[PDB]
């Protein structure tokens, strides 16, 4: 019997041939405020090692891991969730070719239903009378509706971490699919989003007027003390020292995002090319740090995006580079110690996604900046509504405006830059992970 | 000094090495409906022949061809009009990569302004006091505002033959560009679109309180007599005989569209493949006629689409074909004689674009059908609002729904198909080209 339950595809522990491997994060932090004698976290076995753990009865106290059939899991999680819903909500489809709702899609939708149902049955079995249930993200959007039918006594929350598709865009789904998805989520007493634009979009898709479901905005932020302590370890100090050597005495424009289609890395690079073309005074005087670390390697479009990032970076280096200067410093590692050092050094942060739910990098950088950092932020970034007073606004498709914002950011008077950096840090730490989580739990008392 | 003026990129005369030749067709028929002594049609020179005619001072009466500098023409017409605005209004952008509004875009936009201004200045010099000016299509969307400034007395109409972008999609343009485009259009006393959805989208983008612009819906139809006469020439009878032998004793699903990105040929082929998989009784009993004739060869995306259409048709032939049956008959030529024959033969017509202004094919087939034709029509087709009661409706992304409509179409009992065809033919001809255009001229009374 649990009185507080969480459901997410990914739980706190992963097992490998068995050894246990812990990932932290927002949910670990949030549940650490809840009595561990009263909570249960339901999650999925992510691969063979996790399924073996479940097979042997090996598992963490307060965690229930579900063995969902590998082909049903692939079709639900990689198929519908991470391809079809991810693309829908981020507006990423190449309209002449995708989406395609065919017989195979329908088969994969049936698995998505069955994947969600395994979670709903687990929660239904474990939850005390009137328990609070917090369902996390688009993977489990049918759970609230399924679980409402099994257990009308439960208090059910669901939080979407992505954007929500605009109503016109959402109507690409066949009507029966769209409608099943909306009913799935409308089973909740409370639906949460990071921003009111995402919340409004969901509300418009539902037709307005959904009186049993409270729609709310809980924008996730950062724990200042925790991030600062990590950023000031000697390993970061060391790596920062090496990074200053690599950059030289030059200014920095920093990003660290993986090559995900919504991140808008290419147009960012194009804006950098135009900056160096139009404002030649920056040649030998600035370096753009960017990542070409792959987001995904199992879709053709994602592999082509990563390759285009690599190639465009190399074109810019060949055009403007000298023996002493590399204009784009490309990282292909995923090393958080290096990112923290990049955050500490940054003169300019380039956070220009087409659309996103909440990129925390916009919040993380100002919190750890050693001497101030100007933020170039797109209107589609989830952090936009909270940070727009002290960031330089850019419209994500507008490369010329993005190039000009880089110039304004690079020339921002140092005391203005500090005042902005301090106000950005304040807004960024308003709702750390633990209070973000507790507000959702509190919302289920409403 | 003329009292009725028409403006379009393409005029009614083409010069070939010199001989004036008049290609005609439905829309040129319409725009010519007010050729008189007191009228003028301003258009651009399109080949070296046209350019020679202008340089020499050779022209047909009532026609003024403009020699626009070749680089301004390329950037304005191929670039901004046929690439930027075409993609915008049909929603064809691949969001992770395009659109990109950079320095080169800005330079092409300046050419688009100058190209529109060449037309505006010609019209200004040639129009009598309070003359009616009918400007045609998205190429010339700035002319009304430009001309309005030069000549406040003129009565100006503008007709858009494409869709209009939804307000959210239209806001991808930089705000100064979007606002200039809208002010360009709003110079007019009347703005015309083929459908209410398109007019409504423009009205929503324009917002505001524009008291001197009325927005009207004039859907272009077909002249039955001109079309039937062309469809029953001996050359069509002869090509139709051959086509029956190519097909054999089998049903036909017909389309003739070039490989343009909005046409949705790939999803149509996937629906055909699904039809033959789910209703396999149709093997050896139907042939799908489709075209792989190129729409364009100067954009990478258009070359890729043509290659995909070719490849997919070949996969379907390899998958289901036998010595005596080839399921997809691919045409790689552009012969209107063959197309009229296929119109007359068609059991099913497949008109499933993602979005279009008015494709007349949906109207032409029922007009000339020898024995009845079942029309499968997408909700995004321009003809949808007029033809939906007797067409089988499909949603353009729903390949299963499109495959099921193909089955319903092929199994339709002949007398139901006949009644539907007659009603379609009636709807198709309610507003033929000459009246369509005369109503616009009458619209400029007041």
Numbering used by the authors:
A (entry chain A), B (entry chain C): 1 to 17, 23 to 451
What does the paper say about this structure?
OtsA (α,α-trehalose-phosphate synthase) is responsible for the formation of this metabolic intermediate from an NDP-glucose donor and glucose 6-phosphate as the acceptor. In all cases, trehalose 6-phosphate is dephosphorylated by OtsB (EC 3.1.3.12, trehalose-6-phosphate phosphohydrolase) to give trehalose.
Crystals diffracted to 1.95 Å, allowing the protein structure to be solved using molecular replacement. The fold comprised twin Rossman-like β/α/β domains in a GT-B configuration. Our structure of S. venezuelae OtsA most closely resembles the open conformations despite not having any ligands bound. In addition, there is a lack of electron density associated with a loop comprising amino acids 18–22 (peptide sequence GEDGE) of the S. venezuelae enzyme, implying disorder in this region.
